[PDB]
Paper text:
Despite recognizing the same S-glycosyl-l-cysteine structure of the substrates, LmbF catalyses thiol formation through β-elimination, whereas CcbF produces S-acetaldehyde through decarboxylation-coupled oxidative deamination. To understand the molecular basis for the differences between LmbF and CcbF, we solved the X-ray crystal structures of LmbF and CcbF with PLP at resolutions of 1.7 Å and 1.8 Å, respectively. In the active sites of LmbF and CcbF, the PLP is covalently bound to the catalytic Lys270 and Lys260 residues, respectively, to form internal aldimines.
Although the residues lining the active-site cavity are in comparable positions, Asn205, Phe236, Leu83′ and Pro302′ in LmbF are uniquely substituted with Tyr195, Tyr226, Tyr72′ and Tyr292′ in CcbF, respectively. The PPL moiety of 4 is flexible and located at the entrance of the active site, which is consistent with the substrate tolerance of CcbF. These differences in the binding modes of the cysteine moiety would allow CcbF to catalyse decarboxylation as the first step in the enzyme reaction. As a result, the LmbF-like conformation is thought to be a non-reactive binding mode in CcbF. These in silico analyses suggest that the active-site Trp140 and the Tyr72′, Tyr195, Tyr226 and Tyr292′ residues in CcbF play important roles in substrate binding and selectivity in the first step of the enzyme reaction. The LmbF-like conformation is not stable in CcbF due to interactions between the carboxylate of 4 and Tyr72′, Tyr195 and Tyr226, as well as the steric hindrance among the octose and Tyr72′ and Tyr292′. Interactions of the carboxylate with Trp140 align the Cα–COO− bond parallel to the p orbital of the pyridine ring, enabling decarboxylation to form the quinonoid intermediate. Afterwards, due to the absence of a proton donor residue, the quinonoid intermediate donates an electron to an oxygen molecule to generate the semiquinone radical and superoxide. Interestingly, although CcbF has four tyrosine residues in the active site, the Cα of the quinonoid intermediate is isolated from these tyrosines to prevent its protonation. Furthermore, the CcbF Y72L/Y195G/Y226F and Y72L/Y195G/Y292A variants, containing the mutation of Tyr72′ (Leu83′ in LmbF), catalyse oxygen-independent β-elimination.
Residue numbers in the entry:
A (entry chain D): 6 to 286, 292 to 416
B (entry chain A): 27 to 419
The structure:
C-alpha cells in the first residue's frame, strides 16, 4: 500500500521549471494526498539495499570529503568492482584489460571514451554504429563529432538483431562516405528486454575486427536479467575469440544496486586507453567509492543481486497477468533487460494514453521510444515486490478509459 | 612531481601537504551529520528535475544571495551543479556558442588564473589572457582588459566571453569594484557574456570585503548575459562532493540544463545535495563560514610571522582569496626549493604558477588552525638551507 508520491515530490517538484519532459508537468499537477507510482524509469524510488547505505552511514566520521588523488579512483573500489563484474560476466582470467572507476555517471564516461577514441584515430569522417532503438549513445556521438548510424533492433523478438541488421548499417555508413569507427553493443538491451544471441555478438566482434572498428559494450543490465535467463557476455566472447585491443567495457553500478544517483561505474579497456581516458579527457566522491568497496566485498551483495533477479521474474509475471485483465493489446516480456512492453489501445497515442492512465490510476508508465513503432508503452520491473505490486494493484483495480480503444 | 615526492617521504615524520587547494580535512561536522542522519531516507535515485534537488537549489540560491548581497528582485534563475563547476563551465561555453552567430570567437581569461583556458579551447574559443598583477592586492586595472580586447581585435576574433575571478585563484587578490564595473560596462558595449567564478567569494580573510560582481552587475542593469558560477567545495572543506551552483537568465539556464548538460549527464547525488540543504538551512553553516574567515586570517598572519623568522624574501598575503605568496631565495628554482624544503621540513608547498614570475611559491590557507599551525611550526623549527640564497654578487 506504500507509494512513491512523497519521494517524487522531493525530487521532481520545484518553484521553477523542472524540465521539458511531459511527465514533469503531470507530476506537478498530481493531486496531493493521493497515491502515485513511478514505473517510467529504471530507477527504484524505494532506494538502495540497506547493506550499501549502512556502509555510507558508518563511515560518516572518516576523512573522505577531499579530492581523490588517483585519477582511476580508490584502488579498493577498482579491485572490488573488477572482481564483482568479472565474476558476474565470467571474464577469463587471461586478460590485459584494466579497470578504472567513474564517479559522474557512465553517460559522461562514454562521452569521454568517444573523445578518447577520436583522439587516437586519424582525423577523418567518423560513424558511431548504435542500436536503434537504444539508449543515449547517439547523443554523445553527435556532440563529439561522429555521425550516429542506427542498426535495427527488433523489439518483437526476444533475441535481438541478426547479422544482416549490422550489415545494413555498415552499408549505409559506406553509402554516406564515413568510416565505421566504433560499434556500440548493448546485449541486455535498453529498453526492449532483449538478450542478444552469442551468435550475433560473435558476428559483431569479428566484423569489427575486420573493419578495424572499436567495440564499446554497455553492460548496465547484464546482471539484471530475469531469473532463468542466461545473459550473453560480450567480454567472454570477445577475449575467447581473441578480440581485446579495441574492446571497451562500461557498466554502471547504479542500475545493479538501485542507486542510480550514486553515479559509480567502471570502464575496462587496454592500459593505454584507460590511461588516456582518465588523464586527458581530481575525481571525488570517495564516500561512494569506499561504501561500494565494502558492499561489493560483502557476499550479501551477490545474494541481494540473485534475489533481485527472482523479483524481476515474478514482477513481470504479475504485471502480465494484470494487463491481461484490463486490456487486450500485444505484450512482450523478453527477460533480457527488466522491461515489459505493451501496445497502446487503438485510437490512443502513447502520450495521451499515459497521461490519462496516470490521472486515473496514479501509475506513471513510460513511452517505449521505439522509432518505427511509437505507440508502445514500457514498464520497468527492477523494484522490490512490496513496492511494485501495489502499482500493479492500482492498474488492476482503478478504472480508466485509457484501456478502452477509441 | 609533488605526488612523487610524497611517496619517497620517510615513514615516521609528519608530512603536511599544503600544495593543494584542499585541506585534507573532514568536512564540517554538521555537514557530515546531515549526511549520516539521512542514511535511511530514499535519496539514492536520479533527481528528476533538470536543475538538481529542489531543496538544495533553493537553499543554495538563498545562501549565496545573502552572502553575495544579491538584490532580492532579479530575473536570474539558479540551478544546481552535481559534477563540478569545470564541466559546468564547459557546458556554459557550449550554451553561449549555440546562441551566437558562427565565427571566430575569443574567451578573455585572467592570466595567471584557473584553467578556464582549457575549457574554452576545447569548446572552440581562442583563449586570450588579460594581465593580472600579483604584487598588488587588488588585481587588474581597466587598461589590462583594454589590452586583451585590442589583442583580440588584432587577431580578427570577436571577444565573446569574459571570465572574471575577483577573489582570484591563486594570487590572493580582491579585485576592485571600479575594475569590475569597468569590465561589466565594457562587456555590455561589446555584447560579451560575463562569466564570474565566485569559488572563493566567501573565503576572504576576515576584515576583507569581497567585491560582489552580481550586485554591481544588477545594480547597473547588466543582467542579460551575466553568468554566476560558484562551487561549495573549496569553502566547506569538501572538494570531493562536487556540489555548486550556476545562475543566469532563465532561457540560458534552461538550454544549459536541458540540452548541453542534459544530453550528457543525468542529475544525481541527491545524498550530497540533501545534506548540503540541511547544512545551509542550519544557522551553524553561517557561523562556521564566519569562523572560517577568521581562521584564514589568523593562518595567514601565522605563516607570515614564521616566514619573517626563517627567510628574507618578499611575501604577499592580499586577503582576497586564501593564498599566501612568497619568492624563493636567489639561486633557487621554485621546484628545487620546494623539493629541498619538503625533504628537510616535511612541509610540501606549491608553485605559484605565475607565468611572468616563475620562481614564487603559494600556500593555501583554508584549513583548520589546529592542522595548519603544526605545519607552520615545522617551518620554524626544522632548519633548511632552502631559505638561504645560493647566489653571491
Amino acid at each position: 500500500a506504500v507509494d512513491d508520491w512523497s519521494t517524487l515530490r522531493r525530487i521532481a517538484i520545484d518553484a521553477v521549471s523542472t524540465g521539458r519532459n511531459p511527465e514533469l508537468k503531470w507530476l506537478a499537477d498530481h493531486p496531493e494526498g493521493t497515491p502515485a507510482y513511478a514505473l517510467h524509469l529504471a530507477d527504484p524510488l524505494e532506494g538502495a539495499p540497506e547493506g550499501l547505505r549502512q556502509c555510507l552511514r558508518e563511515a560518516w566520521d572518516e576523512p573522505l570529503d577531499s579530492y581523490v588523488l588517483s585519477h582511476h579512483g580508490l584502488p579498493e573500489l577498482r579491485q572490488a568492482m573488477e572482481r564483482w563484474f568479472a565474476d558476474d560476466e565470467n571474464w577469463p582470467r587471461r586478460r590485459r584489460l584494466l579497470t578504472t572507476a567513474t564517479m559522474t555517471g557512465t553517460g559522461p564516461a562514454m562521452y569521454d571514451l568517444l573523445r578518447t577514441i577520436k583522439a587516437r584515430e586519424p582525423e577523418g569522417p567518423m560513424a558511431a554504429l548504435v542500436p536503434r532503438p537504444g539508449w543515449d549513445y547517439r547523443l554523445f556521438a553527435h556532440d563529439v563529432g561522429y555521425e550516429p548510424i542506427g542498426y535495427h533492433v527488433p523489439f518483437t523478438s526476444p533475441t535481438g538483431p541478426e547479422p544482416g541488421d549490422l550489415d545494413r548499417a555498415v552499408e549505409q555508413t559506406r553509402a554516406k562516405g564515413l568510416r565505421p569507427t566504433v560499434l556500440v553493443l548493448n546485449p541486455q538491451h535498453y529498453a526492449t528486454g532483449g538478450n542478444w544471441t552469442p551468435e550475433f555478438v560473435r558476428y559483431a566482434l569479428s566484423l569489427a575486427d575486420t573493419l578495424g572498428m572499436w567495440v564499446l559494450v554497455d553492460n548496465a543490465y547484464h546482471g539484471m536479467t530475469a531469473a532463468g535467463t542466461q545473459p550473453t557476455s560480450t567480454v567472454r566472447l570477445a577475449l575467447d575469440g581473441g578480440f581485446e585491443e579495441r574492446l571497451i567495457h562500461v557498466r554502471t553500478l547504479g542500475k545493479q544496486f538501485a542507486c542510480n544517483g550514486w553515479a559509480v561505474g567502471s570502464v575496462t579497456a587496454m592500459p593505454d586507453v584507460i590511461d588516456e581516458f582518465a588523464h586527458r579527457w581530481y575525481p571525488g566522491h570517495a564516500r561512494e567509492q569506499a561504501a561500494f568497496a565494502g558492499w561489493l566485498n560483502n557476499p550479501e551483495s551477490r545474494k541481494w543481486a540473485d534475489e533481485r533477479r527472482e523479483a524481476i521474474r515474478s514482477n513481470g509475471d504479475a504485471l502480465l497477468d494484470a494487463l491481461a485483465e484490463v486490456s487486450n493489446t500485444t505484450r512482450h516480456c523478453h527477460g533480457g533487460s527488466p522491461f515489459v512492453l505493451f501496445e497502446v489501445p487503438g485510437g490512443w497515442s502513447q502520450e495521451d494514453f499515459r497521461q490519462r492512465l496516470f490521472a486515473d490510476t496514479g501509475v506513471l508508465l513510460a513511452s517505449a521510444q521505439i522509432p518505427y513503432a511509437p505507440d508502445w508503452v514500457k514498464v520497468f520491473l527492477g523494484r522490490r515486490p512490496d513496492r511494485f505490486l501495489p502499482a500493479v494493484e492500482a492498474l488492476r483495480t482503478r478504472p480508466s478509459r485509457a484501456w478502452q480503444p477509441r
